[PDB]
Ligand binder design. Structure first.
Ligand SMILES: [Mg+2]
Length: 543
């Protein structure tokens, strides 16, 4: 048991085999490799280096099993804690570096400045301690879904001037404060206490139940997530940043700049000012919201929205029972709703309305992930489905006027449908749900575009079916059949065949109107699509 007394500099050496070194003067260049054999969580340990009040340790290396205890008024310079060593800090530590399960506990009254947490190292600031000028490079390599709180920085006290690099993680517990942080892309900070003055230069900030975040700026690639029961105030959403406010979250004094994404629901609280004026999402009522660049507003059941602008890259999602009036969707805006929602506004091509009370819609335009669902007994008129838009019809839906499908458009049919107007398909219609449906239209105009249909080639003469009611089938439209019966079994067709397009009440079809997209064989037969004199089209057997 060496005792370095005051003004007696010890200037190299090691420490082993549960031996203590009591420092009252100066002890440079030590190797502490004893005292922590039993693990950080036991008062059963003997050995290590103990810097007393007024003592100094410079360029110590605490390696596996080594324990360095700095008491009140001691100091530890340029310390390397690695490979499962630890430092218990009640005084001053300057320029510590933590590698591979090296730990630093800064207990009440302790102060650590310049700690670099390098990989699988850990700095725990117990309540009443202070960490200043920390660099965190680890803790967050498992992604936003990693629940790792065992490496990185955990604060129960206070952390000032922290830089969080890729893979770095800061957890602020209930009692904790983190003031002035810069969080780069790949790194994150989890806030359960107080985070104040945070710069997300592509970094992530999670604000959980009972966490307060004040003065966060979200630059490009950054993310502020306010969970239920968390609260953020005075956030600035710069271009290509997003603020996420969950049901039960507080977002007050939000500055949504141009290019800023806002993702929230009427079940949260978001007050602020965007590039068009003031906005409020409060108590189930949103007024003035501007969804762009990945922003989403969900108007849940029995809430309301007015003066919403859905711009290119934004999404308005109105649940059934929600209302949203004076909507303006610019070309490239997405609208998700069904015939039980109530929406009014204007889109890229004029006025539109969904009246959830009667279940009739008129003039929709579904682009870029927009979607509408016509529920049972509903009716959508003059629909325009664009690239990446979807129109789904529940069993018992109706169409009215001209249903136009642009290239890249989807229309899914989950049961029998009647259009009392014109379907114009340049995209893809698809009979899905194993029951077979009938799509009745007055006129079909094919502009390319497959209708994906289903067939049983197993002795049934059973299939999906198109019906031209009184009108005409023109253009060119591809038919894609899938055999849903017993495969490798093919039965012969009987007489005229499986009727797939039925012309009725005087309907005519043109002669190159329909065409098999790919061959249809089952078992020993090739199934061929043939138009006859009755204007109807049939599936028949080959050789
Ligand atoms: Mg701990």
């Amino acid at each position: 048991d060496k005792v370095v007394q005051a003004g007696e500099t010890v200037n190299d050496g090691t420490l082993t085999n549960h031996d203590n070194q009591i420092v009252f003067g100066t002890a440079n260049g030590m190797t502490i490799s004893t005292g922590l054999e039993l693990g950080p969580d036991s008062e059963e340990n003997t050995g290590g280096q103990w810097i007393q009040n007024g003592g100094i340790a410079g360029n110590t290396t605490v390696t596996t099993n080594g324990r360095q205890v700095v008491l009140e008024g001691g100091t530890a310079s340029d310390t390397v804690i690695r490979d499962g060593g630890g430092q218990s800090l009640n005084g001053l530590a300057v320029n510590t570096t933590l590698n591979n399960r090296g730990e630093q506990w800064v207990h009440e009254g302790g102060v650590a400045t310049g700690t670099i947490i390098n990989r699988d190292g850990y700095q725990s600031v117990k309540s009443g301690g202070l960490a200043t000028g920390t660099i965190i490079n680890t803790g967050a390599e498992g992604g936003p879904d990693s629940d790792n709180s065992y490496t990185g920085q955990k604060v129960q006290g206070t952390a000032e001037s922290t830089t969080i690099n890729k893979n770095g993680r800061q957890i602020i517990l209930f009692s904790g404060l983190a003031r002035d942080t810069l969080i780069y892309a790949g790194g994150d900070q989890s806030v359960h206490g107080r985070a104040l003055n945070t710069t997300l230069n592509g970094g992530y900030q999670y604000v959980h139940r009972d966490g307060l975040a004040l003065n966060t700026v979200i630059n490009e690639g950054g993310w502020q997530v306010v969970k239920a029961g968390g609260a953020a105030g005075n956030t600035t959403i710069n271009q290509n940043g997003e603020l996420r406010v969950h049901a039960g979250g507080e977002a007050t004094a939000v500055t949504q700049n141009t290019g800023g994404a806002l993702v929230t629901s009427t079940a949260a609280t978001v007050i602020g000012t965007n590039r068009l004026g003031n906005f409020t999402v409060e108590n189930g009522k949103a007024d003035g919201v501007v969804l762009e660049s990945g922003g989403r507003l969900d108007v849940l059941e029995s809430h309301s929205a007015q003066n919403t602008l859905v711009d290119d890259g934004g999404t308005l999602a109105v649940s059934a029972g929600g209302k949203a009036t004076s909507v303006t969707i610019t070309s490239g805006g997405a609208l998700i709703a069904d015939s039980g929602a109530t929406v009014e506004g204007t889109n890229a091509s004029g006025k539109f309305s969904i009246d959830g009370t009667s279940g009739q819609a008129s003039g929709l335009l579904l682009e870029n992930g927009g979607s509408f669902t016509v529920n049972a007994g509903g009716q959508a008129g003059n629909t325009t489905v664009g690239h990446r838009g979807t129109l789904t019809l529940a069993a018992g839906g109706s169409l009215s006027g001209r249903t136009q499908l642009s290239k890249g458009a989807s229309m899914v049919l989950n049961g029998d449908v009647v259009s009392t107007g014109d379907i114009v398909n340049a995209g893809e219609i698809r009979f899905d749900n194993v029951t077979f449906h009938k799509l009745t239209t007055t006129n079909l105009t094919g502009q390319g575009g497959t209708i994906n249909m289903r067939v049983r080639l197993d002795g049934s003469n059973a299939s999906d079916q198109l019906v031209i009611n009184g009108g005409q089938a023109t253009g060119k439209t591809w038919l894609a059949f899938t055999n849903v019966g017993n495969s490798n079994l093919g039965v012969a067709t009987t007489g005229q065949g499986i009727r797939v397009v039925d012309a009725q009440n005087g309907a005519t079809t043109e002669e190159g109107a329909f065409a098999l997209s790919r061959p249809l064989q089952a078992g020993a037969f090739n199934y061929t699509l043939n138009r006859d004199s009755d204007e109807d089209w049939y599936l028949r057997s080959e050789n």
